[PDB]
Amino acid sequence: MGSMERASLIQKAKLAEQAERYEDMAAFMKGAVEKGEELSCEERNLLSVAYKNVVGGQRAAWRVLSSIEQKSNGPEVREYREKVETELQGVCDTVLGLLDSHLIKEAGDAESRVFYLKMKGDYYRYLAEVATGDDKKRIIDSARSAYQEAMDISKKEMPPTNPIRLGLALNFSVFHYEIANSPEEAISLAKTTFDEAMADLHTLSEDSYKDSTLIMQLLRDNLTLWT
Amino acid sequence: MGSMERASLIQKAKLAEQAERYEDMAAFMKGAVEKGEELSCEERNLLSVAYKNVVGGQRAAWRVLSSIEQKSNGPEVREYREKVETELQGVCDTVLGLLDSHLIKEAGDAESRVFYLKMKGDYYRYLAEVATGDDKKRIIDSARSAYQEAMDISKKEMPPTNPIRLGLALNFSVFHYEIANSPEEAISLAKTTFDEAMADLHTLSEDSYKDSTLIMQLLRDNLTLWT
Amino acid sequence: AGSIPGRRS
Amino acid sequence: AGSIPGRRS
Numbered sequence: 001m002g003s004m005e006r007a008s009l010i011q012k013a014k015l016a017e018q019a020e021r022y023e024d025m026a027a028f029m030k031g032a033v034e035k036g037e038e039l040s041c042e043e044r045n046l047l048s049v050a051y052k053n054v055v056g057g058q059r060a061a062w063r064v065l066s067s068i069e070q071k072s073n074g075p076e077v078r079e080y081r082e083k084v085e086t087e088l089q090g091v092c093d094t095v096l097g098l099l100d101s102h103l104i105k106e107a108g109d110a111e112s113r114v115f116y117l118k119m120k121g122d123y124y125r126y127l128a129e130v131a132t133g134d135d136k137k138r139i140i141d142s143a144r145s146a147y148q149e150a151m152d153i154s155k156k157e158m159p160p161t162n163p164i165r166l167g168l169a170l171n172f173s174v175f176h177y178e179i180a181n182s183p184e185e186a187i188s189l190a191k192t193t194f195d196e197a198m199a200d201l202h203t204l205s206e207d208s209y210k211d212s213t214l215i216m217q218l219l220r221d222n223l224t225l226w227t
Numbered sequence: 228m229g230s231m232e233r234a235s236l237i238q239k240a241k242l243a244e245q246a247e248r249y250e251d252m253a254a255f256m257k258g259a260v261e262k263g264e265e266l267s268c269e270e271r272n273l274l275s276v277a278y279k280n281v282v283g284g285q286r287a288a289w290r291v292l293s294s295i296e297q298k299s300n301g302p303e304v305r306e307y308r309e310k311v312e313t314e315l316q317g318v319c320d321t322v323l324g325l326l327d328s329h330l331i332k333e334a335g336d337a338e339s340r341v342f343y344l345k346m347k348g349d350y351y352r353y354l355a356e357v358a359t360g361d362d363k364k365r366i367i368d369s370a371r372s373a374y375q376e377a378m379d380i381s382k383k384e385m386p387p388t389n390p391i392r393l394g395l396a397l398n399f400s401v402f403h404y405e406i407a408n409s410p411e412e413a414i415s416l417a418k419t420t421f422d423e424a425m426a427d428l429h430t431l432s433e434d435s436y437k438d439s440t441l442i443m444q445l446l447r448d449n450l451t452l453w454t
Numbered sequence: 455a456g457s458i459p460g461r462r463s
Numbered sequence: 464a465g466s467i468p469g470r471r472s
């Protein structure tokens with residue numbers, strides 16, 4: 001998207017979201033990142049929304065195909081599951097490459113650095129969902145390392161109700177439960193996160209209260225399913 | 228998809244439908260058509276479902292963008308509406324090209340020939356939705372001609388409850404109402420189609436009754452909105 | 455006005 | 464288990 005102005009790419013990503021054209025939205029935001037400037041808060045959210053929708057559709061398709069393949073156990077179901085898997089891996093590698101070149105290294109404020117490290121954990125987690133064997137081990141460790149660095153910064157630099165801090169903890173708890181085979185660590189992290197947020201709600205405005213309590217309810221929903 | 232077996236393309240189109248991967252489904256069914264054999268009833272439905280979902284998403288996005296553009300009346304909204312419009316036109320041209328090379332000319336049975344001529348009317352109708360001016364006139368006439376030939380065959384060769392005959396009449400009535408500025412022709416066609424189907428329901432099995440009454444309800448729903 | 459939804463095999 | 468849906472700006 002090298003010939004399109006940064007501001008036009010941002011504008012078009014917002015239009016693509018309204019039109020539910022998430023592949024276009026992700027391509028516009030990739031173009032915007034590749035202009036080389038840092039991203040504002042709103043721009044970071046557009047990047048994350050675009051890719052989460054693209055990879056979310058791929059993951060849902062991969063799960064349908066993997067289920068059909070497991071039930072059947074010609075080459076067609078495996079071949080097509082492999083096709084979708086390779087496409088998913090390519091999208092995850094693209095996002096990880098944007099984070100590595102050069103969004104994380106330029107992110108100095110806690111809000112930006114935690115946001116990008118949470119993305120890095122999420123996209124390694126999606127790689128881990130489709131990985132097997134020893135590849136799976138190193139990919140799992142890469143997710144864990146990214147989430148852990150984000151957690152360490154978030155606990156030092158953000159209040160316990162901050163929505164990015166909350167969503168990081170939610171997604172790291174899902175990583176523990178679903179990827180790392182550590183359900184007790186998942187439950188402990190979700191409970192501690194919920195309780196420490198509850199105790200800080202009194203400091204919030206009405207609108208911030210709504211933002212934080214929405215994520216707290218997601219932590220509660222997981223705790224109800226896990227306990 | 229020239230190196231993939233026909234049967235494998237069909238198999239993968241069915242998997243792509245289950246996975247809600249409609250762009251893949253359409254590419255598999257294009258590959259299957261291009262093998263050069265005629266399509267069975269089930270295969271014709273896979274082709275139609277795939278493309279209706281692809282172009283349906285494009286049309287929904289084009290309508291969102293066209294609405295934003297009309298409200299605003301920089302170049303970005305128009306440029307992006309034009310992008311989506313060109314993509315939509317390309318998908319319609321691809322389907323029309325499959326029908327022309329060579330599905331229609333090889334279709335001798337009424338069920339296949341009516342099905343393909345209804346598709347031809349539908350994809351010219353989608354071209355007409357985005358067309359302007361005199362281009363619009365010739366595109367509108369191409370839709371009308373395809374639907375009219377399908378109607379003439381359907382009335383000679385199929386019972387008034389046949390689901391393809393019913394869906395053809397429904398879509399031709401939408402063409403009259405929405406494209407040709409002929410609401411009275413739309414209402415007359417929907418009413419006559421509904422009444423002549425009602426009078427033939429007594430001939431049907433329970434399962435055929437369900438198929439025909441489902442489409443009749445769609446005719447009724449339009450008549451309620453138009454009257 | 456609805457056409458055949460036509461989006462499920 | 465639900466992660467952040469994260470699919471709407």
Ligand SMILES: *Cc1ccc(S(=O)(=O)N2CCC[C@@H](OC)C2)cc1
Pocket residue numbers: 045118163164166167168211215467469
């Ligand atoms: C990873 C993640 C955490 C939280 C959210 S949010 O709460 O939906 N949100 C996005 C807009 C900016 C912030 O709003 C206050 C946080 C999304 C993703």
Ligand SMILES: *Cc1ccc(S(=O)(=O)N2CCC[C@@H](OC)C2)cc1
Pocket residue numbers: 272345390391393394395438442458460
């Ligand atoms: C254009 C059109 C008309 C009717 C249908 S259907 O009734 O949903 N259907 C598809 C499967 C084969 C037939 O079932 C008896 C008709 C779809 C598209």
